[PDB]
């Protein structure tokens, strides 16, 4: 029953011609609900979840103004960082930003985040106390000194503990049928001979939400990691996720092996056996 709101910004310079490509996306937990793309036709923040579509014109106007401002900020900062790193005007570079808030089952602030990257590596991040910054190198240290003198952390903190939490609460209510639902995994096992003497058992988890899940194999009641393989959790494309875990076993010994499934949607972990 804990929840999160996160926004993700990616700005990529294109020296061959025009402004950076800027893409912003917003999430509640594992559900995307808004987007902005500088190259799309609307030039508006756009809905990507049915439950946000009820917000009024005033909402979209405010979100569009703020996200367009952020794209210009990123444009400027791409030029500044190119200079800090003594880079040429000729190449493409990337700024990424993530921020947002976590709340407990009670709806109250738990944690806030704000962190920034340059060309895929840490640049500057707000620490968990929301009062201090971690700068990865001497370029980011410049930013850190400027942001401390400007008291940026105070303003970030006020948003993360304030409006971030308040709007996450509103969205959880307006979208509750989906956002406050847990969908436990639909599970089954398959069996695939490799030879006359060995077979693959594959434990499947489908249709679950949220994405966090754990699949574990045991043999005769004890965890087994040897001879196992698993795929990374992956989106089905319909708002649910999928995962599998497999183990190779001596043919005939299948009944010694159990797959154990943990998910927030399951009040007790599930156990499957061939």
């Amino acid at each position: 029953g804990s929840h999160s709101m996160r926004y993700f910004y990616t700005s990529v310079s294109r020296p061959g011609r025009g402004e950076p490509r800027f893409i912003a996306v917003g999430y509640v937990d594992d559900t995307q609900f808004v987007r902005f793309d500088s190259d799309a036709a609307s030039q508006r923040m756009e809905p990507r979840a049915p439950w946000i579509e009820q917000e009024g014109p005033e909402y979209w106007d405010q979100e569009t103004r703020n996200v367009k401002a952020q794209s210009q900020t990123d444009r400027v900062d791409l030029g500044t960082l190119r200079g800090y790193y003594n880079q040429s005007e000729d190449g493409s570079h990337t700024i990424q930003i993530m921020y947002g808030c976590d709340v407990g089952p009670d709806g109250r602030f738990l944690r806030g985040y704000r962190q920034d990257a340059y060309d895929g590596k840490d640049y500057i991040a707000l620490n968990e106390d929301l009062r201090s910054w971690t700068a990865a190198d001497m370029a980011a240290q410049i930013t850190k000194r400027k942001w401390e003198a400007a008291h940026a952390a105070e303003q970030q903190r006020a948003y993360l503990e304030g409006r971030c939490v308040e709007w996450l609460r509103r969205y959880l209510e307006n979208g509750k049928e989906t956002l406050q639902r847990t969908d436990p995994p639909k599970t089954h096992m398959t069996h695939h001979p490799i030879s006359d003497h060995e077979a693959t058992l594959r434990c499947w988890a489908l249709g679950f939400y949220p994405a966090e899940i754990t699949l574990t194999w045991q043999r005769d009641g004890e965890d087994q990691t040897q001879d196992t393989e698993l795929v990374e959790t992956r989106p089905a494309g319909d708002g649910t996720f999928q995962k599998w875990a497999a183990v190779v076993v001596p043919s005939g010994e299948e009944q010694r092996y159990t797959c154990h499934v943990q998910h927030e949607g399951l009040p007790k972990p599930l156990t499957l056996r061939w």
Partner: peptide, 10 residues
């Protein structure tokens, strides 16, 4: 809703 528009240059 996103953070307020307030420019803190890097």
């Amino acid at each position: 809703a996103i953070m307020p528009a307030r420019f803190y240059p890097k």
